[PDB]
Amino acid sequence: GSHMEILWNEAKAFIAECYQELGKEEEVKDRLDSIKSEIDRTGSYVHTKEELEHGAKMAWRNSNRCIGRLFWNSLNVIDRRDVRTKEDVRDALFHHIETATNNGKIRPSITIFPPEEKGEKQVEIWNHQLIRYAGYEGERIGDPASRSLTAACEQLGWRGERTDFDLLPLIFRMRGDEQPVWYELPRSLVIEVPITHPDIEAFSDLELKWYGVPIISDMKLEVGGIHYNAAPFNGWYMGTEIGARNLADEKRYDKLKKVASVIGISTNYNTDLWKDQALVELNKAVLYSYKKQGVSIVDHHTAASQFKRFEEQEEEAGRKLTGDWTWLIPPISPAATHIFHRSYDNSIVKPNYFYQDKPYE
Amino acid sequence: GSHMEILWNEAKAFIAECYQELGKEEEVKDRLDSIKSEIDRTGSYVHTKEELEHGAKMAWRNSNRCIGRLFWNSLNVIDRRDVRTKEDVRDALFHHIETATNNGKIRPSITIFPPEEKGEKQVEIWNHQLIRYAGYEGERIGDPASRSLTAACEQLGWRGERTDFDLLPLIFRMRGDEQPVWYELPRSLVIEVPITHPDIEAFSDLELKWYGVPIISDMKLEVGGIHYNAAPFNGWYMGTEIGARNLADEKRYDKLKKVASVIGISTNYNTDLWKDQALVELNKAVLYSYKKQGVSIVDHHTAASQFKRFEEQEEEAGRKLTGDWTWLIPPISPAATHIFHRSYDNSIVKPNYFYQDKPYE
Ligand code: HEM
């Protein structure tokens, strides 16, 4: 009763806004009549390729926490609403990885899977990111952030070699099944980059490496009232995410003290700012490495610079700019970018991407 | 009518809270009766030395934007509510600088001047900070942030030598006067620190220097409904304020490109992260310099560390912790401190320090 109401309201708002940007303002009337009857007949409606394709772009545009929004209208939308089997999902996910990686020249993409019907999911992705390292304990081994999921995967028959860089398998659940299925990722499909330094040879002794493409797979894409709980998307990495966070946080890989060792500085006094010097060399190492292997990556200054350009375009287009200051600023040298020196309206506008409760844990 | 009401309400709240922390809970009743009659008789009330002394500490404790709050109960409170002349104010300000500096071993202090009576100020301080460099234009000369005030001072007969480090004079206005008076600061009273690097000799070619003690002089101290528009206070510097902001911001001294030059790195590509490397060396230079001249200063890691300890004590004391995440995180390596990894309630609690409209501009 109330669900059929919210749906209709969100649909009217989205079609109008969408068709207005698409230059199909006259087609709004006839399109809404079709949707009204569809919601009554079934209890939901089916987007057109053009609608979800542009709704996925708009959602990216409204992602307050994303710094790379300047490239919103270039998103490669892959429609996989025709998937029925676990093999279809697996192949789609394999396809996403292959096409997004694009031999290094990363292509920002998103694979749309069937959305929820009567609130129930058709495809449920468990993975945070399609490619991600596992985490274990006795003493820290791997990525701590992957612990709860690594345990869940292991409760399904999967076993990691217990190195710091074990690739978690693809784990998802189809409607009608009680437990998710899993598939080990084909290594030929996964690009990893060993981390080295341009001027410091000893850096390779740290034996650090990271994967090339971050593919957030556990967020909900909401478009015109339709909940696409499964819509894996990807951009390329901003070096800081790997160097100033993934390999730096005490709760993650905690490598700063070790970096200080190989670069030849002491860790005795904070006044020497060894952590800061360590972060700069670790981050330079990351940028130099990806570039060297031919994998797309962006430094935080270029990214902020591109994001400034984004803000201007939104002003030029007549749209209100929204953002989360605390996430837009890079973890390293935030005051060196314009983002630090201004404020952002952190209001939620749809369509968008949202967090959803994890099936495990 | 309404002013006499707000005053009474704020007073009841403060005395109770104050006397509770002071262990003088029984004296609350008798103290409030005296205040009630005082407000009726005159239209305001006079704090006791103990009250404003502790109210100034509490206010510091509630300063969401201050990272050095762990040292709140050690604040050296100087009561100068007996000042009547411009000479009294001038001497008090000279005294504050002398006693706070303390030959380098900076002493966190605050000089309390007469508060507002019927909304009107008795002493109006124009200076943002007691010691501060001037700013000019044709091309940038000095500190851009001091421009509007430098122009105002010059409209009063003062003239700067137009170097990048001209000391602004003390400028304030007494009740009853239309224009403020000014007094050049005695150099013997002002500690400045030339900036040098421990490992890079050429750094001195930049000829950078900064003053030792930051003394915010334009904030309002509100305690139990009493508005002390003039209450200059000071702590010591956190290196980042000078190196990652005062000398780094494009709108301030903009020295990063020049720092890159003296340390021997190129400014050609963002991927080399030259700004970050530049910031680290500039910041190390700052810390090493103050320490070398015997002037108190604190690095951002020690400060965050001290602030963590602060949060714990507030939990142990039973008090709610409040803070502004965007100001607590240091401009350099914020993710390396605990402040980055948590959230803070940015609610305003009194007593406190507030911004007030600038007389100039
Ligand atoms: C093209 C390159 C892209 C760059 C450089 C970029 C960069 C970023 C960065 C640095 C963050 C912060 C990540 C973190 O701190 O964990 C972020 C978050 C986000 N980005 Fe992107 N992004 C890109 C593409 C995309 C795409 C293709 C989409 C969606 C269609 C998108 C959606 C989002 C969203 C929803 C967030 C928030 C994620 C979260 O809360 O965990 N971004 N992006």
Ligand code: HEM
């Ligand atoms: C003892 C050493 C102290 C340290 C290390 C310290 C540090 C800081 C830092 C780093 C900031 C940010 C400044 C900026 O970004 O411009 C700040 C702000 C502030 N501090 Fe402190 N502080 C100290 C003492 C004090 C004292 C003595 C008081 C007051 C009695 C105080 C009151 C405040 C207030 C109100 C702010 C906000 C200032 C503004 O908005 O411009 N702090 N403090």
Ligand SMILES: C[C@H](O)[C@H](O)C1=Nc2c(nc(N)[nH]c2=O)NC1
């Ligand atoms: C919530 C979390 O603990 C923390 O407050 C924030 N995390 C992040 C952040 N910034 C980015 N980009 N990514 C984060 O994960 N700033 C704030």
Ligand SMILES: C[C@H](O)[C@H](O)C1=Nc2c(nc(N)[nH]c2=O)NC1
């Ligand atoms: C308001 C200003 O432009 C900016 O948003 C903020 N300034 C400061 C900041 N942090 C500190 N400590 N000091 C600032 O001046 N972060 C945010």
Ligand SMILES: NC(=[NH2+])NCCC[C@H](N)C(=O)O
């Ligand atoms: N640039 C991006 N597309 N980032 C998406 C999130 C990546 C995540 N912060 C990571 O380091 O794994």
Ligand SMILES: NC(=[NH2+])NCCC[C@H](N)C(=O)O
């Ligand atoms: N540590 C302090 N007490 N800082 C107070 C403000 C100083 C100001 N940010 C400056 O650099 O001049």
